[PDB]
Amino acid sequence: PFITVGQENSTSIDLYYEDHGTGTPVVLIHGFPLSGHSWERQSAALLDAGARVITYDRRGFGQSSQPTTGYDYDTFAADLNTVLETLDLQD
Amino acid sequence: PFITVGQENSTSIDLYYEDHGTGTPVVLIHGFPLSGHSWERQSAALLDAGARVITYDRRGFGQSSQPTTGYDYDTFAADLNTVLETLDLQDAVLVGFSMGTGEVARYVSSYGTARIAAVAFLASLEPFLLKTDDNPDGAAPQEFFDGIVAAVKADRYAFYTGFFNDFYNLDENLGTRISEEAVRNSWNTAASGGFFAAAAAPTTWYTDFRADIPRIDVPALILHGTGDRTLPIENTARVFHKALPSAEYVEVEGAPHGLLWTHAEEVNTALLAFLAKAQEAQKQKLLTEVETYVLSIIPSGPLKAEIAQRLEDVFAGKNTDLEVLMEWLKTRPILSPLTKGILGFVFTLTVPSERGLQRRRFVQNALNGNGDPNNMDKAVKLYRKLKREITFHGAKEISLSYSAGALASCMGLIYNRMGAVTTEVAFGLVCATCEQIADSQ
Amino acid sequence: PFITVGQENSTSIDLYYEDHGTGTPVVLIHGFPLSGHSWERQSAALLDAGARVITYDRRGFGQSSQPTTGYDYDTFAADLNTVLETLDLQDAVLVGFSMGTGEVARYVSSYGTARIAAVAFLASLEPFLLKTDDNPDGAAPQEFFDGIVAAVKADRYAFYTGFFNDFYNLDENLGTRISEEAVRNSWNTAASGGFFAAAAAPTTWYTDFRADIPRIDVPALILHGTGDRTLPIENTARVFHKALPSAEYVEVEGAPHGLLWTHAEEVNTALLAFLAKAQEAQKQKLLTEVETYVLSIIPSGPLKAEIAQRLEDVFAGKNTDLEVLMEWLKTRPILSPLTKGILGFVFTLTVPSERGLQRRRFVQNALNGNGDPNNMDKAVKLYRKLKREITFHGAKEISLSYSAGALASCMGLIYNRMGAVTTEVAFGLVCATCEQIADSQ
Amino acid sequence: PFITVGQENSTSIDLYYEDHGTGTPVVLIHGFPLSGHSWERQSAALLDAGARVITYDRRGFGQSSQPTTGYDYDTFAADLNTVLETLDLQDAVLVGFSMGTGEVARYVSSYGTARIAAVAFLASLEPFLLKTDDNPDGAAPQEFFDGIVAAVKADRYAFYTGFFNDFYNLDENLGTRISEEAVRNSWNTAASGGFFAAAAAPTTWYTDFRADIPRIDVPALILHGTGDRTLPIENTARVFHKALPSAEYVEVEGAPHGLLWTHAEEVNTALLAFLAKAQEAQKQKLLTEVETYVLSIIPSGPLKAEIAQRLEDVFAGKNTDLEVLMEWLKTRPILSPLTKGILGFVFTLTVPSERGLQRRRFVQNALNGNGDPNNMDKAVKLYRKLKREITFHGAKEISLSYSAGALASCMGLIYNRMGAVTTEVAFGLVCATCEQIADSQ
Amino acid sequence: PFITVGQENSTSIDLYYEDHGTGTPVVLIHGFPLSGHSWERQSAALLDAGARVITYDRRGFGQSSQPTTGYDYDTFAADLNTVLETLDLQDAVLVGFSMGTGEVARYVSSYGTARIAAVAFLASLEPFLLKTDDNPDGAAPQEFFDGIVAAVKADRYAFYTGFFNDFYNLDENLGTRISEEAVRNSWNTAASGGFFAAAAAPTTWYTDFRADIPRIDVPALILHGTGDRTLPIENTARVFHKALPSAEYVEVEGAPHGLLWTHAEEVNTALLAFLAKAQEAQKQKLLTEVETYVLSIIPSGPLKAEIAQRLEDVFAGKNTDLEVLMEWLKTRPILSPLTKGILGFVFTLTVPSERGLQRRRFVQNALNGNGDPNNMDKAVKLYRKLKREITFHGAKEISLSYSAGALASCMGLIYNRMGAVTTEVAFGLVCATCEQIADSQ
């Protein structure tokens, strides 16, 4: 699954994401140089404990697009914002 | 390529699939923890042998989506159903390996065999792996499966290593039947499947397929490796054949679970012979149908007898000297030029070897649609539609909505290599034309 | 068939015309008091010699409308102009007999020679029949013409009788050169012209064509019968040739005015050697026109030299083993398959002896177009339009409104005998496709 | 990202591609059995040097679809064509490595060089690898290639191992030029390509590119490693340069086939210099285009001569004291204040050394727009759109949908640093405003 | 009047035709070198006898267009086809004279006899005029026909004179059977045909009609003059009748080729009697159909036997005393009153002589639709439609869309002379009603 966060030249910038379980939404944001899948041990526990688990791949990592732009925390935070708004995450 | 099979929260569930070759559709359903690509040795053979090869990745594996839902044979069979319906597969062969054999049984059982010509079971789960009081032949107790789940959850990555060991009988086959690189590829494929699917899959393995088996309607093949460490031939294939005596049954001597690679040969040869038999039967079913339509245009008499005999001989594969055939046709008295063109067309299409014969003027003149631009316009429109057809009946059906003049011109278009369609679609076209002409008489 | 040239009160003015044969257009303009049908002996020869023959009936004569207006050479020339423009005649030969020679001079003079390849004057009015002070060589005084008008008005029917007497030198030629029945037909034709036109025509005969003659731009033929009683060779043809020395000049020994019938072989002969030459000259030009377009596609080099030479040889009628030619083409390195197909197509079209050679796979593959139905659709649409074309230019022009892909496919349609078109139209198609391809490079 | 290039049965054929940076487009075409990502060392350099980098994965490789059809250079070139047309690439550089050099030759040859500024061939197949009677310099006999196919079909996974050995000269370069990890990545990439494509690819390697070479129209670079074990420099690059003497030619001393990684430096440096030359030419073309638009606004005369000369000098990098330039402009008689502002704007944009010069009041006054909010509103709307543009043409095109007043104000916004845009987009804006103004005169 | 049959260059090809009288259509096809007007003596008789007379001028003759193309029997037959289809002629009689007999044979042969009730051959070409080895009965050698062509080309005008001599046996018939004025008219007609058609026509005369003859499906008449100098009765009519024994055959004693004029009487009398027979045959064919429908309503038994016998007897033309018939019907036990009305109606319709019998109350009461205004309304609507019908099947077809009550009332409307329709349409109505009633049982 993808969420589009912007545009680079002729191509859009898409973030790879996953959306598992039901209940209170928990958003996991991975580290360098890994992807959303690195949370697999945590995701399983959260799923068993009864949470909705959201993971995504930061731009340039895992299965997300690989632009040569937007490598800074304001963009990264704006990327996150787009995800939260796109999914209408509450609480 | 993807087919969407459902929805998980905000995301859809998509299956990765491939669609190669032309001819009778053969659907390959992979095993754990691999993908559609694991069939590569079989796919190549089927492609060369003249089949349409469909592969897909089960949910949670290969390039398919990785949900945390729907890990059970009813869902897996429903997934398969969606694929078959999405592609509008007719007269399909379903081939399952290991886990895949669960799909084959459950689909056939629940959804029936309307689209399905034959089935094949390779390294089967059937009939019921769980060892119980009522299931004595079961391969293992429940506690054993509980163990695998626990092992995968602990470290699936490390787990895959020991699994492929037994999967392939590496102690026997490494550096011999299977290379270290081939094994490396398998581990990579497995590591690429979803974490959740990996641990959830083994719970589906002791599904009771005992009530599915009596539902198997169509010709079946059962094939197992006698050296199978993963699915003991004695608790699976051997008790399965008792339940389905009618099944054609092949033991691969000392073959492991992963016999698709190690014994691709023995595998492909059994599959191909059976498939060849099926293909010959199809030719008889298509060839005899074509023949009746073709003969319906010829006036009754001794000439009609000669033609029928010639048709039958080329259809039965006696490679005929097309040049000699075409000259005979050309010089036949009483036969209408149009009828000569149709037969001319049919013979060049069916004859094994054209031997680099140039197209014939007498046929070209017969199938030119009178050089009428309106006929030709409609012939081009029909051709556009026929390009999208894959079956004899679909082809024949759309062709019947066109006039005999447009149909003959369309045949000319194909004959002249100005356009191209599959042989079975070409057959449908010629038969629609024959029907139209015969009906006018 | 009719062409509308104007309006008289509530009625339109329509000219009766005919349009026969194929090849270089030759326009025949009849004399008084006859019609386009009077050229029948010449038309047959021209048709056999391979020309396109156009005849029409002057206003007031034969099957044309019979107004009481427009009896003058500017109107007559304007009438002719309308015909030429209506039919979009290119590279045309204008042949006038008697009155008709007035049209030829006046049209050329006023409208110029853009559509006109050559002219011919048979039993000419030129340069000025009226005998005056400034025109001493004039054939008769004004009072003489005034007389004819008066005679026709008195009894045109009776008048035609004495007229055809001298028109044909019947005292010499009856029962010999001309039959009584042939003369009867002529009288019937005349009696069928309009009453008003009959009396009005003779007033146009002493039109001064002296300023028209220097305007004659193109090769001309002057032909006169030395026994002409109607137009004395001494006041007409002989002084006309002085005014146009450049004109090719033929005297028919003892031939009357009506030499088209009595000496058909005479004038016809001194004409065929003219029309045939024009046709050959036209082919030479049209031939170079095709060759230049064809060559524009080929990369410069020694191969381009060989091809050009082969084209020229086939065009000159010398080269002829198509099978050898096609194999050579087929085996040429560097040449694009598409360029090979175009040349393949051109050679089979131009070679006289195709013999019994089947169409070539290499050409078929090159022209067919990849089998895209959209492309094929447009090729069929073009073909529909080309079927209505009869000229190289008209064909080439409509072809240029289509893409190179659709054009190549259209060429394939024709090559495969799926549609049929005239050689000159086929040439236009080829040249449009060559132009498009070359232009893309 | 994907571009669809065709259809296989029920599935489309999609090419994986990437599109990075801004400036002159450079298209990188990878080798066997790798993907667009293999260019990563080159891409980084090109990005830093200021180019737009386009990569894509050939059908059957990397992340592209894996059909069992279209494995031939005409299809591969058609695939490339679709990419170029899809992206509307103008003035593009085509760079091929190994297999990729086949695309470059065949595309240029068939489709021509309308979109193409220059070409580069790295570790080339050219001119014809097959050793025949007519091709003595050929690198190997047919039987040799037949061998590779057989080897890949046997175990492609194991095959990749020995292949990368010679591909990289690992016996020389491992732990030195190339790391074990870098090699591991390459094997993973290859293992990820389609099984069918892997075995089908080697059949395309002895494609005869001999007739493609004379078609190479544009400046070319040929680059080869002298230690190439995969494509012997003696049967490839060296005989290729004889066929194309005009090509700029670079031998990399002791470089293997996989010189993109092992000798990235030597590779990037040659590429960048060649590219810089091409880029300079492109800049000159843009300047001429910009210069012509800019001059169209100025009244003809000696002043127009001075300005043109100054433009040319600044564009050629020679003129550079902006303060002196701006004062000259400011004090020019006859020149419209608006035209002074436009030139003022252009000079500050093109001059390399702006130094520390404050923006000029005379320009600000000329571009601002009288302070009408409606005008300013439209200028802001245009700016929003221009912010998304990366090309001169795209910029110029959207600008033309705005009034001259709004355009001038937009120029002022940029000039005043109230908004920001790339130089090439700024050029497009200026040229649209010049066009509008000139067109009003 | 004209029918367009094709295109020649810029002009269409139009056939002059006429369409006179009412009743069964009779199509007259003229001979060489005459026109449709040559049938004037026959047309007058047919018009008086109550037939619809269609004439047309063959291409190149009379008032038709004069192309230089299409002078062959397939084109001539295609021309005829266009006429028949254009006019939607049903149940037509084709009558050919001389050349015209070629059209009749070739049309029947190729296009079949769907529109055609009967054929007639007068002064026939058949079966094959060319004297060969395989055709010994042939009238002349090839060299002989070659001669005629040469003669027409030399002077067609003079040629017509000697031709009409033998055409009419003028040495016998002039001033006796044919006037000098009648002959003058013929020459004028011929002189008016196209020059090209005149010379081209004689080449069509030795067309081999031998394979056309077995195709003659319908009743035929062969008629020849024993004094025929143009088509020797011994090489034509006499060998033709051997080939078609079934043909009705009439020799006109000492009649020439041009027997249409000289022996119009003997010609018209034979024609009219044959024509009269054809209608009777059609009526006989219709009567058995009616009888089966009528009988379907009667219960099986001895009464049904009596009725059937009575039907057959009236149908076979035994003029029955209607009064006696109607009383018998009236007094029949078991028969439903409605069934009695239907039979009552049928008998009065079919009986030769009603003898001024007043309509019967028992029938009127039976066919009154119950006096229901809704039934009557629908009956009137049906009647409106039936008024436009001319065939039994068309009539029967529309009647079936109405209820049995409305149908019976409609029958009453006709029976009561409140409305009128043709007998065959009345038959269709009664049969629809019978079908509806029988179907309800």
Query: Residues in chain C whose beta carbon is closer than 8 A to a beta carbon of chain E?
Result: 1, 18-22, 37, 40, 43-44, 47, 52, 87, 179, 181-182, 184-185, 188, 390
Rg (CA), chain E: 27
Chain C partners of E157 at a C-beta cutoff of 8 Å? 179, 181-182, 184-185
Strands E11-20 and E220-225: what pairing? Answer: unpaired
Say if the Cβ atoms of C87 and E10 lie within 8 Å: yes
Q: First vs last Cα of chain D: how many Å apart? A: 46
Question: Does chain B reach chain C with at least 3 CB pairs under 8 Å?
Answer: yes
Nearest-by-Cβ selection for C376 from B360, B368, B419? B419
Nearest C-alpha neighbor of B431 from the set B305, B320, B288, B312: B288
The DSSP symbol for C218 reads S
Which chain B residue has the Cα nearest residue C378?
B377
Say if the Cβ atoms of B65 and A40 lie within 8 Å: no
Nearest C-alpha neighbor of C333 from the set C363, C360, C299, C310: C299
Mutation for D interface: C334, C335, C437, most D CBs within 10 A: C334
Reduced to 3 states (helix: H, G, I; strand: E, B; else coil), residue E111 is: helix
Query: Residues in chain C whose beta carbon is closer than 8 A to a beta carbon of chain B?
Result: 358-361, 364-365, 368-369, 371, 373, 376-377, 380-381, 383-384, 387, 409, 412-413, 416-420
Rg (CA), chain A: 13
Given a contact cutoff of 8 angstroms between Cβ atoms, the answer to whether A22 and A89 are in contact is: no
Task: List b or e across D386-395, with b for residues whose CB sees 16 or more CB atoms inside 10 angstroms.
Answer: beebbbbebb
For the stretch B423-426, contacts whose Cβ atoms lie closer than 8 Å and that sit 24 or more positions apart, written own/partner, are B423/B349, B424/B286, B424/B390, B424/B391, B424/B392, B424/B395, B425/B386, B425/B389, B425/B390, B425/B391, B425/B392, B425/B394, B425/B395, B426/B349, B426/B395
Given a contact cutoff of 8 angstroms between Cβ atoms, the answer to whether C422 and C22 are in contact is: yes
Q: Which chains are within 8 Å of B by 3+ CB pairs?
A: A, C, D
Identity (one letter) of the amino acid at C14?
Answer: D
How far is it, in rounded angstroms, from Cα B99 to Cα B116? 19
Residue tagged active-site, from D57, D79, D212, D228? D228
Mutation for C interface: E7, E10, E187, most C CBs within 10 A: E10
Strands E52-56 and E11-20: what pairing? Answer: antiparallel
Question: What separation in angstroms does the CA of E320 have from each of E280, E313, E327?
Answer: 18, 8, 12
E190: which residues sit within 8 A by CB, 6+ positions away? E33, E34, E156, E160, E163, E164, E198
How far is it, in rounded angstroms, from Cα D352 to Cα B205? 72
- Cα angle value B235/B241/B245 (rounded, 5°): 155
Nearest-by-Cβ selection for D211 from C333, C440, C441? C333
Nearest-by-Cβ selection for D47 from A12, A66, A68? A68
Whose structure tokens read 């028109």?
A: C167
Asked if D228 is an active-site residue, the reply is yes
Nearest-by-Cβ selection for B416 from C377, C380, C416? C416
Chain B partners of A40 at a C-beta cutoff of 8 Å? 195
Rg (CA), chain B: 26
Identity (one letter) of the amino acid at E367?
Answer: L
For the stretch C136-144, contacts whose Cβ atoms lie closer than 8 Å and that sit 24 or more positions apart, written own/partner, are C137/C234, C137/C235, C137/C239, C138/C206, C138/C235, C139/C231, C139/C232, C139/C235, C139/C236, C140/C206, C142/C206
Strands (E) across B83-216 are located at 92-97, 116-122
Minimal CA separation from B192 to chain D, in Å: 12
Chains C and D form CB pairs within 8 A to the count of 10
Nearest-by-Cβ selection for B416 from C381, C383, C418? C418
How far is it, in rounded angstroms, from Cα B250 to Cα B124? 12
Question: Does chain E reach chain C with at least 3 CB pairs under 8 Å?
Answer: yes
Chain D partners of C441 at a C-beta cutoff of 8 Å? 112
Nearest C-alpha neighbor of C73 from the set C204, C169, C172: C204
**Experimental approach:** X-ray
Say if the Cβ atoms of C387 and B373 lie within 8 Å: yes
Question: Does chain A reach chain B with at least 3 CB pairs under 8 Å?
Answer: yes
How far is it, in rounded angstroms, from Cα B206 to Cα C278? 95
How far is it, in rounded angstroms, from Cα B27 to Cα B20? 11
Given a contact cutoff of 8 angstroms between Cβ atoms, the answer to whether C388 and C425 are in contact is: no
Nearest C-alpha neighbor of A9 from the set D276, D393, D4, D53: D53
How far is it, in rounded angstroms, from Cα B249 to Cα E307? 76
Minimal CA separation from C440 to chain D, in Å: 8
Strands B116-122 and B92-97: what pairing? Answer: parallel
Which chain B residue has the Cα nearest residue C375?
B380
Chains C and E form CB pairs within 8 A to the count of 46
Mutation for D interface: B2, B40, B54, most D CBs within 10 A: B40
DSSP 3-state percent helix, strand, coil across chain B (nearest 5): 55, 10, 35
Minimal CA separation from B366 to chain C, in Å: 10
Identity (one letter) of the amino acid at E251?
Answer: E
Identity (one letter) of the amino acid at D285?
Answer: K
Mutation for D interface: B39, B63, B181, B424, most D CBs within 10 A: B181
Strands C220-225 and C248-252: what pairing? Answer: parallel
Say if the Cβ atoms of B195 and A22 lie within 8 Å: no
Structure tokens at D226: 């002298």
Rg (CA), chain D: 26
Q: Which chains are within 8 Å of E by 3+ CB pairs?
A: C
Neighbours of C435 (CB within 10 A): 18
How far is it, in rounded angstroms, from Cα D22 to Cα D45? 13
Nearest-by-Cβ selection for D390 from A9, A65, A67? A9
Chain D partners of A12 at a C-beta cutoff of 8 Å? 1
Say if the Cβ atoms of D161 and B181 lie within 8 Å: yes
Query: Residues in chain D whose beta carbon is closer than 8 A to a beta carbon of chain A?
Result: 1, 18-22, 47, 52, 87, 388, 390
Say if the Cβ atoms of B361 and C358 lie within 8 Å: yes
Minimal CA separation from A68 to chain D, in Å: 7
Say if the Cβ atoms of C333 and D210 lie within 8 Å: yes
Nearest C-alpha neighbor of C57 from the set C8, C2, C118, C11: C2
Say if the Cβ atoms of B44 and D195 lie within 8 Å: yes
How far is it, in rounded angstroms, from Cα B219 to Cα B213? 12
Minimal CA separation from C162 to chain E, in Å: 21
Chain A partners of D20 at a C-beta cutoff of 8 Å? 8-9, 67-68
Strands D2-8 and D11-20: what pairing? Answer: antiparallel
Task: List b or e across C181-214, with b for residues whose CB sees 16 or more CB atoms inside 10 angstroms.
Answer: bbbebbeebbeebbeebbbbbbebbbbbbeebbe
Given a contact cutoff of 8 angstroms between Cβ atoms, the answer to whether D61 and D34 are in contact is: yes
Chain B partners of C369 at a C-beta cutoff of 8 Å? 418
The DSSP symbol for E298 reads S
Query: Residues in chain C whose beta carbon is closer than 8 A to a beta carbon of chain D?
Result: 299, 333-336, 440-441
Nearest C-alpha neighbor of D17 from the set D79, D70, D68: D79
Task: List b or e across C300-319, with b for residues whose CB sees 16 or more CB atoms inside 10 angstroms.
Answer: eeeeeeebeebbeebbeeeb
Say if the Cβ atoms of A21 and B68 lie within 8 Å: yes
- Helix ranges, C192-336 (H): 195-204, 237-243, 259-262, 264-295, 302-315, 322-330
Question: Does chain A reach chain E with at least 3 CB pairs under 8 Å?
Answer: no
Nearest C-alpha neighbor of E342 from the set E305, E311, E302, E386: E311
Helix and strand numbers (H, E) in chain D are 19, 8
Reduced to 3 states (helix: H, G, I; strand: E, B; else coil), residue C248 is: strand
Identity (one letter) of the amino acid at C47?
Answer: L
Reduced to 3 states (helix: H, G, I; strand: E, B; else coil), residue B51 is: coil
Minimal CA separation from D112 to chain C, in Å: 6
